[PDB]
């Protein structure tokens, strides 16, 4: 049966570890894909890890990072959560160098973008069958979430960006039913910048927390109903969630220009005026990870926080991170449980290898005892191929 | 339930990318079969990639291409679409050095031809159980589609050739129910030459577009009803569909003798007087691929065209290509969707290796926005074993 | 539903190739078990390949044939027919250095013998659960079929041997329901010798064709009803079915002493006074394979034959061979279809390697066009490990 | 449906071999995890082998045993019984360096403990969904069974220890329904020491046989009803069950201090005043294994016994061992069948390698004929990586 999506988020005091795949450790000898963007999404039966690959395995010559991000070889694929991304346990999903995926309760929806930078096409599959497409409307690198879309009552929702990572781009929200786009709207957001949105349902509404690559070191957000009537803003907290970023001062409800260029895929959970912020430990590099609870960090600008839980050690490698949810139809709970994944990037540019790949850890929000720690990748680099 | 097969082909203005397995890139380290003829066919539940193997893996000594094409080691096998053809994810189908496969809605039908050059036997399996055999009637390399067969109303249909690739041969159309041959007819086609037919259903009828290895650089066709009452011809378009071929001149509704010797497996879709032609970019070798819409190419002789969409770049390796359809019982559409696959041949004879294998890309016909590009194999040759 | 087993064997004029796994060819690089005794058995849903392994893979040091046949490491395992015996696609069945398996229509029965030579225990599993055991009654290498047992109307049947391979041993027939032995009888067979019986159902009765290791170069048989009331004899045909054997003279309805010592696992199909004999092409070594039809070879002693079909070339490697059937509950036929498998042994003692393993080919009996040929192993020995 | 758990243990006169995975032998070439604690547990449909991994494979550099036992990389995973623990056939369960698992009849319950030594958290999953957490209450290495938990009437039960392995610690019994902790009680057991409990159901009650790492060379026990009303004691038999241990003298119903320091995970089955003791053959190291029936060993102090059955030879490697049961809902029997597994440890500290891993053999209790033998690991050490 289709997901209702009408209950609020679960109250969450801590994050319990849910999975760890040890991809790069195992891939040293085993046949494991070189991957990026290991996002998680759940059906009413299971939870899956989606990822992007150049069609190359670790410790092989083809893992040579000479190929561009947006290449003809890049594919979206999925494996069971906690298992390694192997050609022997992965479903092929779509040919894509930018992707999104979500289950409406009946079938899997996957959004795969491929093609040239000046005319990329996003191909929509529902139950493995192509059901719709969209072409680039600004002819400048059509790109999407790199994490799960959000589904409420048989409609799934996503956000796409067309334009520069450098300045003003064009941002669109989409409403999708059974793989077919039934409504879309462009966001009136001058001076804002949206990339790689983490989106989730909450009381029949979707909230996305994204990445400003232009001039924001805090995170932009967009929230909308099913008719795509939206509000936009930035996370006001002085606890800045992007990377790179400055040290924590008083925040802003607009874009924080200080160290605002570049960014990393991220997420955050809104609870009234409060926010659960997932971010790196390092302000300048992709090192460490921590969950921080600010009871007024959504609308307030002060840099005060009450709860902080360690996820990845300051000296260890992290990277991309995204939100994912588990619905009452899967858990049997009365609310929608918030969860998150972290990509643990190893190799270039930070380390002396010829390749780059990411590990995967994930955590679920629970209202019971938890603990801070460090769950890093664990691979000993460089590898045999280097 | 049985596939009805009584609706028209879907109107198609473009081709969206459906799959890419990157199998040769992955097969550098991974345990992937050395394959040829990666044809796709679909059940009402899934789509599968069938292929032929010498029973050898990439980067192994057994992949040494000294063994003849019609060896006793050759086997037909299948794997899920977009995944690598590996011994760990492949389903064994039949012992064959020539094959065809299709799903009637209830069960899989596979046709595997093996045996000596002068007395080959086609073994027919319905649901993996041997249900019939056909013996070579002209004692000269009995051979079939290397592509999916077509099914209508609980009957599946195929074309088989017995005789030389050098001149006049014998061609038979077959009607199959539950894996049993219920009716066959020999085609009365002097001066014609049919090999490796790409066949598809359309309004309760089957259309095959084949390969003239004798004296034709345009593609021969045959079409028939359920009682096997047939018509024959060639594609009249000046846009020549075979390889090798001459440059585009005024076409012919018979065989075009210019560079008509030899060829490559191919396909085309008929829409009234018009034709969707898929072909290589080079006229001499198997390089590049493109889709061309000629509104008057089926029956008209001129070499004008409306639409052209790139698939594989001019300097990139292509090879075999074939058609497959998706029935409304799979898609929920009102028509039968045309799709196609391309084999991307790497190694001998063109490249300095000891082996030869094909990669896989597939596309499906949509009436929404698409884009031309190049989706090539991508493996760095030679390999360790070379 | 449970197999009736009450119809007669299918009339068979020829043998169509059913499978070929190319194990040793693929195992050169891939992770494939070193195997012996690749027998086939079928459930109403599928057909499976069972095999014995020392728990070692090809091209690995552990494949060193220093270990004895009846060791603690030997396990019975099964993989889908035509697929390679890999740790990634094989079900574990039982710890055994001698085995049998059959499906009664409801669940799998497996018989696994392990333990010391002077007190071996056969463990009976039904649906993976241990349901019964038998201990060695003569304390001399308790051993069984090395091929499928036979099931008629919810009772499965097998034959076990306890005693010397050198002279008179003890032979017992068993009746098994839901994995539990409900009746057994000892065979009153002085001067006879039974090892490695190939057994099949036929009109509610079981016929086994076995291997005389003592002093018979023709094959002994035993046939019985469901109450285990049995008849015994030898195949009278001058076309001798064992290996080693003499050249074809006039036969005997008793044991043929000439070249009677040693033997090979084999099979034969009784049709009234006639017999389908499967045997090697070489009289002294395990080379080649052929099917021979003698219209009076069961009860008559003359060495005349009307039909002969080549399976494996005279210069190629063969080995063990067994019978298997497909019931009307699987095929939809009115009779029980006879089929057979051949093990293609490579390595020691015949070849200069450190190991020994077998390939697998199988054939089904059909009443339509067939052909003789040679489908050999195909591996290039010696391997890297040697 | 829920497992009733209200019948008695089956009467058992011997142990028949159930499985052997030969994983270290296969892992020489194959891609097999370096594992510890290969405990077995059964659903009403299948039996599975759970295990812990550092996320490393055999013959890889990552298998370097310098990483601590309670690392962040440690994960609980499962595979079908008798198959190798491979990344290609293993199901991810939880992130854990200490674990327990059981099936209540409806769904799998897994318990995975991870986190820092001073604040470990037990994460409970029902059907793969986090349902509860328990935090370390004594802040000293919270740890559990390393063996299956026991389920009765839709409730599952486990034992957890918090405190030193050096002296007095804290021990708690837990009652779990649908993955939620409904009741727990602390054991009032001064002078006692419980670790790594092997627990099983019997007539609506649970009996655990554990490891005294403090000052006991005989095994401690605890037993309780559904309300967790418990009894405690030690196994009085002079046949000592732990390792290290002294030679068999007069026993004690309290802790036997002689060689009582340290130990190994083990199990035993209670039958009234009698006990089935599984133990190592050596008294100093982890070598050999045997089953012993002492008709008065549970409550009596003498060191006499009736039955003894060999499992692993005196000079062969053994290690951890634990109990698992098969309920009547799986077997169709009238009682609850006792079974057990043995871990076969190869490598450090005993052997000159860089790694440590365990093999797996399992046995089930039958009332029919059995035989003593030796079923050892069998791998030739050292390996290429050593
Ligand atoms: C990865 O790719 C790079 C770029 O193609 C390779 O760099 C080459 O290194 C050799 C050194 O002998 C030079 O001769 C080439 O000219 C380099 N190429 C370029 C474009 O500068 C590198 O060898 C590759 N690494 C692999 C395959 O492991
Ligand atoms: C194609 O054939 C299908 C199935 O044979 C037709 O659907 C049937 O149409 C008849 C006509 O009244 C109905 O009685 C049945 O209820 C239909 N069956 C199903 C399964 O739908 C369909 O009409 C045909 N379409 C055409 C002719 O275009
Ligand atoms: C592939 O097979 C061919 C032919 O069997 C091998 O070529 C041989 O190479 C030798 C020199 O090493 C030459 O004398 C001949 O041309 C070939 N021999 C024969 C008997 O034809 C080639 O070595 C093989 N490649 C492999 C196994 O990697
Ligand atoms: C297979 O096993 C045999 C027997 O153990 C090994 O033979 C040994 O060969 C070496 C040669 O240096 C001798 O030193 C040993 O004494 C031999 N053993 C015996 C019992 O004679 C052989 O090396 C093994 N092959 C492998 C592991 O590949
Ligand atoms: C063990 O418990 C089972 C299930 O609770 C008992 O079986 C039930 O017994 C009651 C008693 O009349 C019947 O009403 C039900 O029909 C039974 N249910 C099932 C599923 O069989 C069983 O009696 C108990 N066995 C004992 C007490 O030894
Ligand atoms: C396993 O890990 C250990 C410790 O990290 C490695 O041992 C090192 O070896 C060097 C000499 O090569 C010695 O100086 C030290 O004893 C160790 N170094 C450190 C920093 O502790 C060992 O090489 C590793 N084995 C592998 C990777 O195979
Ligand atoms: C959520 O939706 C379901 C189905 O529409 C409804 O039954 C339920 O009352 C809703 N829950 C709310 C509004 O809390
Ligand atoms: C929920 O689903 C029903 C069923 O289609 C739909 O009609 C209704 O609009 C929905 N309610 C929402 C979206 O709140
Ligand atoms: C075989 O058995 C079935 C069920 O017992 C019966 O219906 C059928 O008549 C039998 N076939 C024969 C005797 O030919
Ligand atoms: C076939 O099965 C029935 C059902 O159990 C049995 O009663 C009868 O004896 C059988 N008939 C045979 C074995 O011919
Ligand atoms: C074919 O479909 C069924 C199967 O034979 C038959 O009943 C029906 O009349 C036929 N329909 C056609 C030929 O369109
Ligand atoms: C436990 O089983 C069910 C579940 O609570 C309950 O109805 C029944 O009364 C109980 N039976 C016992 C404790 O034996
Ligand atoms: Ca930024
Ligand atoms: Ca041609
Ligand atoms: Ca003999
Ligand atoms: Ca102790």
Numbering used by the authors:
A (entry chain A), B (entry chain B), C (entry chain A), D (entry chain B): 83 to 468
Show passages lifted from the paper.
Stimulated by the first neuraminidase (NA) crystal structures, the NAIs were designed to interact with the active site of all NA types. We identified a novel isoleucine to arginine change at position 223 (I223R) in the NA of a virus isolated from an immune suppressed child on prolonged oseltamivir and zanamivir therapy. In contrast to the frequently observed H275Y change, which causes selective resistance to oseltamivir, the I223R mutation conferred a resistance phenotype against both oseltamivir and zanamivir. Our results support this suggestion by indicating that a ligand-free form of the pandemic neuraminidase adopts an open conformation. Together with this structure we present the structures of the I223R mutant neuraminidase in complex with oseltamivir and zanamivir to investigate the resistance mechanism of the I223R mutant neuraminidase.
The first striking feature from these data is that the 150-loop in the ligand-free I223R NA adopts an open conformation, as seen in the first reported N1 structure, but in contrast to the closed conformation of this loop seen in the recently reported crystal structure of the 2009 pandemic A/H1N1 NA. Recent NMR experiments likely clarify the apparent discrepancy in these different studies by showing that the 150-loop is flexible and that an equilibrium between the open and closed conformations exists in solution. Inspection of our current structure shows that a phosphate ion, from the crystallization buffer, interacts with lysine 150 to stabilize the open conformation. We speculate that the different crystallization conditions used in the previous pandemic N1 study led to the stabilization of the closed form. The open conformation of the 150-loop (residues 148–151) generates an additional cavity at the edge of the active site that we have previously called the 150-cavity, which we have suggested to be an additional target site for neuraminidase inhibitor design. In the wild type N1 neuraminidase structure, a small pocket, the “223-pocket”, also adjacent to the active site, but distinct from the 150-cavity, contains two water molecules. In the I223R neuraminidase, this pocket is occupied by the side chain of R223. In displacing the two water molecules seen in the wild-type structure, the arginine makes a hydrogen bond with the side chain of serine 247 (S247). As a result, the side chain of S247 adopts a different rotamer and is oriented towards the active site which enables it to make a second hydrogen bond with glutamic acid 277 (E277). These changes in the structure of the I223R neuraminidase result in shrinkage at the edge of the active site pocket that accommodates the hydrophobic pentoxyl group of oseltamivir.
